[PDB]
Each structure stands twice: as C-alpha cells, then as structure tokens.
Design a protein around this ligand. Structure first.
Ligand code: HEM
Ligand code: UMQ
Lengths: 55, 431
C-alpha cells in the first residue's frame, strides 16, 4: 500500500508496475516460443508429426 | 548434298555421307508410346525387342548386318546397318521382317522369352535408374491422362498382361505405309535405294490410315516417390514448353542453354559462364544438373533435372535455380544470350553432325514424318543468330513467369518443399 490503506502511493506504484509487467510477459512469451520451437507443435491425432510437415 | 525426298507410294528419304564407311537403311513409323493406351503400354517396346531377338539378329549377322531399334514418344524406328556395298542385303532383311515374316518372330517361345526379357529390363530401370525414372515420372504427372504421359518402356502391369494379339493389333494399326518413311543414311545414294525399293511390288495394307485420339495437355502438378534408403535426391522440374515446329522452338532451346548442364566433379564444368554456379558452389548444393527443352508433336517441357547428396539444402538449390529462371523475363544480359547462341550451335552440330548413321537415320525419319522434310544446320544457325534479348524475355514472360510447374522426385526428398513454395518462386515481387 505504501501507507495505511489503498491511497495515492498505491495507485501511483500500481500504474508504474502496470507499465512494467507487460514487458516481462513479452520476455516470458519469447521463452515460451523457445520451448515450443525445440519440439514443435503437437497435432490433433496426438502422434508424431515428423512424417508430414508443411512450412 | 541437300537431302533428297522422293515419293512413289512409299516415301523414301536419304542423306548421303561421303566420309561414312557404313550405311544404314530402315523404316521409321510416326507412332510411339504416345499412341498407346495405359493398358497396351509397352507394346512398341516389346516389338523393338522381338525385332532385336536372337533369331532375327543371327539371320542379320550371317549377312554381315547389325540391327538397331528405338522406341520414342512420337515415333518408332527399325534400322539395319551394313557396309556401303551390302546395302541391298539390308533391304531384303527389312522387306522380309515387315512383309514376309509374321508368325516366325511371333512364335510362342520367342514372344514369351522376349516378354520375360523386357519385363526384367523394365523392372531394373524402375528399380535402379533414378535420374531417367524421375524424368519419365515428370512426363507422367505433367501430361497425366493424356497420350504424352505414358512411359516409352511401358509399365510392368500392362507388360505382364500383353499377348501376341496385342502386338498384332498395334502392328495392323500403326505399321502402315501412310505412317512410315524408309530412311537411308551413311554411304549410299538415293537412286540406289529408291530403285531397289521400286524393284519389288505389293502394298501390304494400302491407303490404311492410323488411329486418331485426343491431344496432349499440360497440368501443373507433382508426383513424389520418396525413398529414404537411397543416397541422393533426384528431381526433375518443368513448365509447359514448345512442341516441334513451334515458332519459339529455338528460343526455348537457347534459354535452356543459358543455364545449361553442370557436373560438380568436372573441373572445367565448375568454370562455366553460368551465373547460377556462383550461388550453388559455395555450399555445394548439387552433384549435377541439366536444363532441357524437350519438344514433341503436341507439346513440350522446359526445365531441369538435378541430383544431390545435400539433402538439407534442397530448398536453396530449387530457390536459386528458379530465381535465375526469373531473370529470363526481366534481366537476362546480351552476353548470356550470345554465349547461349554459340553453345547451342555446337550442341546441334554435335547432334546432327555425329559420325553415326543410325543416329542420322532416326533424326531424318522423325523429322520428315512430322514436317515432310528435314531442316538444315545452315537454316537452324541463321534462326539462332537472329534471336535477341527481347525474344528471350518475350518467351520467358509467356512460358516461365508466374506459370504452373510439373515436379517429380525420388530418394531423400523430404527437404523438397510443398508445391506452392516452389510455384511461388516462378516470379518475383515488383512495385
Ligand atoms: C501471452 C500468452 C501466450 C502466448 C503469446 C502464447 C503463444 C503460443 C503460440 C504462438 C503457440 C503455438 C500455436 C498454438 O498452439 O497456439 C503456443 C503453444 C502452446 N502454448 Fe502458449 N501462449 C501463451 C500462453 C499460454 C498459456 C497460458 C499456456 C498454458 C498454461 C500455454 C500453453 C501452450 C502449450 C502447451 C502449447 C503447445 C500446444 C501444442 O502444440 O499442442 N500457452 N503458445
Ligand atoms: C501491417 C498492415 C499493412 C498491410 C499492407 C498490405 C500489403 C499488400 C501487398 C500487396 C501486393 O504486393 C504484390 O503482391 C503480388 C502477389 O500477390 C506480387 O506479384 C508477384 O507475384 C504474383 C503471383 O505469383 C505475380 O503474378 C506477379 O507478376 C509478381 O510480380 C506483386 O509483385 C507485389 O507487389
């Protein structure tokens, strides 16, 4: 809170943090895409997709 | 000295060669694999082999003669070779085989033995000859459900179902005087041949015209024969080309000469004036490639064939090649066109001025059957020298730019991308 209750300090820090987290999410999405890339996507049959890929 | 052409019922065509020490006399029919159907496919190939059968060859050999036969898409030939003096002995054999004999060569033992022979022959080709097998499949997919799609050797399925009757049916329908031309090449005079032919009589199915059918059509498509157990990837790719006697026949052949042929293992081949070579040698994209401009009566194929052990970079091989083709429409240079002219002339000269009478026999017969005469190198060379950069660009903008392609491949082709990725490369982005 930065005080005795939700007040000025709380709102100002929340806005600063609201600006920041989206960039952390972006970084986490890059990490998400990296994990995805090494094994590739799965498919609806649940079996190997290695025998028939398309760009 | 200008190739004579006389007709008295039977069209006789000769090409005298004073430097030749042998002579070739034979008959060329204007019917080939393109005149068969999916079910009798291979009948012509079977005929070629019974004609080259031991019994028939032994008879010819006793007379000091050599037999040759070639099954093509639009035509079919049967030639006898001998010394310039034994030229009349060739005619007797030829006359015998296509007028006297019939039940002799089509006997149960000869036909079955020959059938078994071509069966193992075709099986070996389909099993081991990868570059040619792929080129045959290019024709098959490009002209599917059309005459030009049938392989010249026939298919195993139709071959094993063929009986003596099928051979006879084809012979009665195609081996006709109206669909033939008797050729004479090497060291022989026209009069000597025409009088020796005019010596005999008879007709054997006179006035009879061959069967007709539906015309060849090109279809953008592909056939993929993946085989991961093979050491390379063999690919053939092409667009609809030019038929024989097309106004762009030479412009197309010259365009193909621009990109030419290549053998990575030949030192001089790596030094050719081909811009594509700068792109493909850095990471050695292929072992070899050869561009072509195949021409037939109803249609043609323009493109290339390639073989490669670089299975992870096939996409670059195809991409760079097609990007070079793009250039024929927008930026091909004058020197590329001039280099192509010189090399095309050399190619044609080597093809037509070969020291082989049988080759001349096949070429002469095939051409006279299609246009009634044979074009001379003198005229061909003149047409070639007249080709300009604008002619190449006009032809490319019509046949290459944003046009459908036919693809065939076998071996380790996992790296060959989907049809659309390859098809998109037939053009470039423009403002
Ligand atoms: C901003 C958030 C996210 C982004 C941008 C994102 C993006 C992607 C993309 C582009 C793919 C590949 C295509 C697809 O399958 O949809 C993917 C796959 C996947 N994502 Fe996400 N994702 C996000 C959140 C999540 C969440 C919240 C979970 C799970 C708790 C998740 C689990 C997965 C999994 C398991 C796959 C693989 C699906 C498969 O191939 O079977 N993702 N994601
Ligand atoms: C972030 C939002 C912005 C969106 C803006 C939208 C972008 C629109 C781009 C539109 C056209 O871009 C244009 O695409 C066509 C293909 O469709 C290209 O065409 C190219 O490929 C086509 C198709 O094989 C050929 O026929 C053509 O001769 C060739 O030039 C053209 O050269 C390019 O200039």
């Amino acid at each position: 809170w930065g005080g005795f209750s939700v007040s000025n300090p709380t709102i100002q820090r929340f806005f600063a943090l609201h600006y920041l987290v989206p960039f952390i999410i972006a970084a986490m999405v890059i990490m998400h895409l990296m994990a995805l890339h090494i094994h590739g996507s799965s498919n609806p049959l649940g079996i190997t997709g290695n025998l028939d890929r398309i760009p | 000295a200008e190739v004579t052409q006389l007709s008295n019922g039977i069209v006789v065509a000769t090409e005298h060669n004073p430097s030749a020490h042998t002579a070739s006399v034979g008959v060329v029919f204007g019917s080939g694999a393109a005149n068969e159907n999916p079910y009798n496919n291979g009948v012509s190939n079977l005929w070629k082999n019974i004609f080259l059968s031991k019994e028939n060859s032994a008879v010819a050999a006793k007379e000091g003669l050599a037999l040759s036969s070639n099954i093509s898409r639009d035509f079919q030939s049967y030639i006898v070779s001998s010394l310039p003096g034994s030229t009349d002995k060739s005619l007797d054999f030829l006359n015998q085989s296509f007028i006297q004999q019939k039940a002799n060569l089509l006997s149960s033992s000869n036909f079955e033995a020959t059938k078994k022979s071509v069966l193992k022959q075709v099986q070996d080709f389909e099993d081991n000859d990868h570059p040619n097998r792929v080129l045959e499949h290019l024709h098959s997919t490009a002209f599917q459900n059309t005459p030009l799609s049938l392989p010249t050797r026939g298919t195993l399925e139709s071959l094993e179902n063929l009986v003596v009757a099928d051979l006879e049916s084809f012979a009665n329908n195609h081996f006709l005087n109206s669909n033939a031309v008797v050729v004479g090449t090497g060291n022989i005079k026209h009069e000597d041949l025409v009088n020796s032919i005019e010596s005999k009589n008879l007709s054997l199915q006179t006035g009879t015209k061959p069967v007709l059918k539906k015309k060849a059509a090109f279809l953008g498509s592909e056939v993929r024969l993946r085989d991961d157990t093979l050491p390379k990837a063999w690919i053939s790719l092409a667009v609809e080309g030019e038929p024989v006697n097309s106004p762009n026949y030479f412009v197309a052949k010259l365009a193909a000469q621009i990109f030419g042929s290549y053998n990575a293992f030949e030192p001089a081949s790596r030094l050719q004036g081909i811009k594509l070579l700068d792109n493909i040698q850095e990471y050695q994209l292929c072992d070899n490639f050869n561009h072509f401009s195949l021409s037939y009566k109803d249609s043609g194929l323009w493109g290339f064939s390639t073989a490669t052990r670089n299975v992870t970079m096939i996409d670059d091989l195809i991409h760079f090649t097609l990007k070079q083709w793009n250039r024929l429409t927008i930026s091909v240079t004058d020197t590329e066109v001039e280099r192509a002219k010189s090399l095309l002339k050399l190619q044609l000269g080597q093809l037509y001025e070969s020291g082989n009478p049988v080759n001349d026999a096949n070429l002469l017969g095939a051409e006279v059957l299609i246009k009634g005469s044979k074009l001379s190198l003198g005229e061909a060379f003149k047409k070639i020298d007249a080709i300009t950069v604008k002619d190449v660009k006009a032809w490319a903008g019509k046949r290459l730019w944003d046009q459908d392609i036919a693809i065939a491949g076998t071996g380790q082709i996992e790296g060959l991308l989907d049809y659309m990725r390859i098809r998109s490369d037939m053009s470039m982005m423009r403002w």
